[PDB]
Amino acid sequence: MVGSLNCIVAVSQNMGIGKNGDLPWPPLRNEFRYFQRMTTTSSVEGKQNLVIMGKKTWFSIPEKNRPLKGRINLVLSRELKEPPQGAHFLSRSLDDALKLTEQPELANKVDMVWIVGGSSVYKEAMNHPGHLKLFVTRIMQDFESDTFFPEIDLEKYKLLPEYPGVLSDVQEEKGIKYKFEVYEKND
Ligand SMILES: NC(=O)c1ccc[n+]([C@@H]2O[C@H](COP(=O)([O-])OP(=O)(O)OC[C@H]3O[C@@H](n4cnc5c(N)ncnc54)[C@H](OP(=O)(O)O)[C@@H]3O)[C@@H](O)[C@H]2O)c1
Ligand SMILES: CCc1nc(N)nc(N)c1OCCCCOc1ccccc1CCc1nnn[nH]1
Ligand SMILES: [Cl-]
Ligand SMILES: [Cl-]
Ligand SMILES: [Cl-]
């Protein structure tokens, strides 16, 4: 069937993830490469991963890069009547999106599911019962932000010391240090 359920996010020390429709920090090439590799790579031959994102996250991607290449793209919105141009799936909630992954059109095409933001998308996922992993890049600086990542409940999640294919040491680009973290729960 469909593979694992995952969130991926990059978060500043003040829990910020975005600012004026953009990232709060200047672009970090390798953080982007990690995001792309993690969400694109599929363990199952012939299948692609599904990325689920909110409407504002969709429109924050430059038009030339939509939809996200090599992945099935799904947008969450209650106001849009049809998937925006370049997208082919649109759901009213994360719960609806996950139910959509068991219909034939998605079931045998989708491996892993990756929630890629923004704030209210993460929130619905981290309430969702069941097996969930959070791939969290800790950007070790404050940045002025206007949208935030919900705090992790450490009574539900375990922080894994290492995760396969993920370096656990401090990264640094453009004067900005950060670390890749992986949390897991199984409600
Ligand atoms: N650092 C990171 O990892 C990261 C990741 C993603 C985005 N960002 C940045 O954060 C900002 C975009 O994120 P955002 O939080 O402001 O907006 P967003 O979550 O991407 O989009 C918000 C809209 O999407 C719909 N939506 C969101 N969650 C939903 C849910 N659970 N169920 C149904 N619909 C849902 C709603 O659309 P309707 O009003 O039409 O119903 C909502 O108004 C940008 O600045 C972006 O650059 C950062
Ligand atoms: C890399 C940031 C990030 N990192 C982690 N770990 N998780 C996330 N969910 C995450 O956000 C992804 C946001 C949706 C994909 O955004 C794309 C895709 C292609 C081109 C430009 C953008 C706009 C953001 C941007 N990235 N670099 N410059 N601009
Ligand atoms: Cl990408
Ligand atoms: Cl692949
Ligand atoms: Cl946290």
Swiss-Prot record:
Widely expressed in fetal and adult tissues, including throughout the fetal and adult brains and whole blood. Expression is higher in the adult brain than in the fetal brain. Pathway: Cofactor biosynthesis; tetrahydrofolate biosynthesis; 5,6,7,8-tetrahydrofolate from 7,8-dihydrofolate: step 1/1. Its main location: mitochondrion. One of its GO terms (molecular function) is NADP binding. SUPFAM superfamilies: Dihydrofolate reductase-like (SSF53597). It holds the Pfam family DHFR_1. GO terms for biological process: axon regeneration; dihydrofolate metabolic process; folic acid metabolic process; negative regulation of translation; one-carbon metabolic process; regulation of removal of superoxide radicals; response to methotrexate; tetrahydrobiopterin biosynthetic process. Coiled coil: none annotated. Keywords: Cytoplasm, Disease variant, Methotrexate resistance, Mitochondrion, NADP, One-carbon metabolism, Oxidoreductase, RNA-binding. GO terms for cellular component: cytosol; mitochondrion. Changing residue 65 to F: Increases affinity for dihydrofolate about 3-fold. No effect on affinity for NADPH. NADP(+) binds at residues 10, 16-22, 55-57, 77-79, 117-124. It is an enzyme of class 1 (oxidoreductase). Changing residue 23 to R: Strongly decreased affinity for methotrexate. Decreases catalytic rate constant 200-fold. Decreases affinity for NADP and dihydrofolate over 10-fold. It is found in: Mitochondrion; Cytoplasm. It is linked to Megaloblastic anemia due to dihydrofolate reductase deficiency: An inborn error of metabolism, characterized by megaloblastic anemia and/or pancytopenia, severe cerebral folate deficiency, and cerebral tetrahydrobiopterin deficiency. Clinical features include variable neurologic symptoms, ranging from severe developmental delay and generalized seizures in infancy, to childhood absence epilepsy with learning difficulties, to lack of symptoms. Key enzyme in folate metabolism. Contributes to the de novo mitochondrial thymidylate biosynthesis pathway. Catalyzes an essential reaction for de novo glycine and purine synthesis, and for DNA precursor synthesis. Binds its own mRNA and that of DHFR2. Belongs to the dihydrofolate reductase family. PANTHER family: DIHYDROFOLATE REDUCTASE (PTHR48069:SF6). This is Dihydrofolate reductase. It comes from Homo sapiens.
